[PDB]
């Protein structure tokens, strides 16, 4: 499978999450995603086929994970934006006020701005700290997906949002959305990963 930020993958034939970013760990191919999406050694499938397993994760506290892929997978420096692509150029962290977009399999590609950093989400499982907030909308299924600027700087992976009964927060004004992502930089240094760029 071609590994692109934003696309669907399943975990142990049950949950769905979205791919965050293609990365490598020495000769190993992988992708970063949210930690709440799978436990270590959970099987990841893309389009019915086994592409790899969860190698590590931290959830709650933080919300991060990376999936080690088999050699057959093609890693690509890209995030899906409809039928088009955004090239991953690096991971400079954007400041509050910066515009940002996110990509996932439920709501597609949505943009908004970063409104706050170091937010705590109190999920049923425990708190997750250090999250950045934007007001781009998102829905159930988008977790793990890419948050990236138009210029190609990877910001982090989708953690959670104040979804309404329709499963997303796209039907409430941007001013009332709290869509949270896990910063990419600590995930890259914690697992010794390098971002695939183009």
């Amino acid at each position: 499978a071609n590994i692109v930020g934003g696309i669907e993958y399943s975990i142990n034939n049950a949950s769905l999450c979205s791919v965050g970013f293609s990365v490598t760990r020495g000769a190993t191919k992988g992708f970063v995603t949210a930690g709440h999406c799978g436990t270590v050694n959970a099987t990841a499938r893309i389009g019915g086929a086994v592409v790899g397993t969860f190698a590590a994760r931290v959830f709650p506290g933080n919300d991060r994970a990376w999936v080690s892929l088999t050699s057959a997978q093609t890693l690509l420096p890209r995030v899906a934006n409809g039928s088009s692509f955004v090239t991953v150029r690096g991971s400079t962290e954007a400041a509050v006020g910066a515009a940002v977009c996110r990509s996932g399999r439920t709501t597609g590609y949505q943009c908004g701005t970063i409104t706050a950093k170091n937010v705590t989400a109190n999920y049923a499982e425990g708190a997750v700290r250090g999250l950045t907030q934007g007001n781009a909308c998102a829905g159930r299924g988008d977790s793990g997906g890419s948050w990236i600027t138009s210029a190609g700087q990877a910001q982090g992976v989708m953690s959670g949002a104040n979804v309404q009964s329709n499963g997303n927060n796209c039907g409430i004004p941007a001013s009332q959305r709290s869509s949270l992502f896990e910063r990419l930089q600590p995930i890259l240094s914690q697992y010794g990963l390098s971002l695939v760029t183009g």
């Binding site: 709440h36 989400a121 977790s143 959670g160 949002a161």
Partner: peptide, 4 residues
């Protein structure tokens, strides 16, 4: 906010 809930996970996703």
């Amino acid at each position: 906010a809930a996970p996703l």
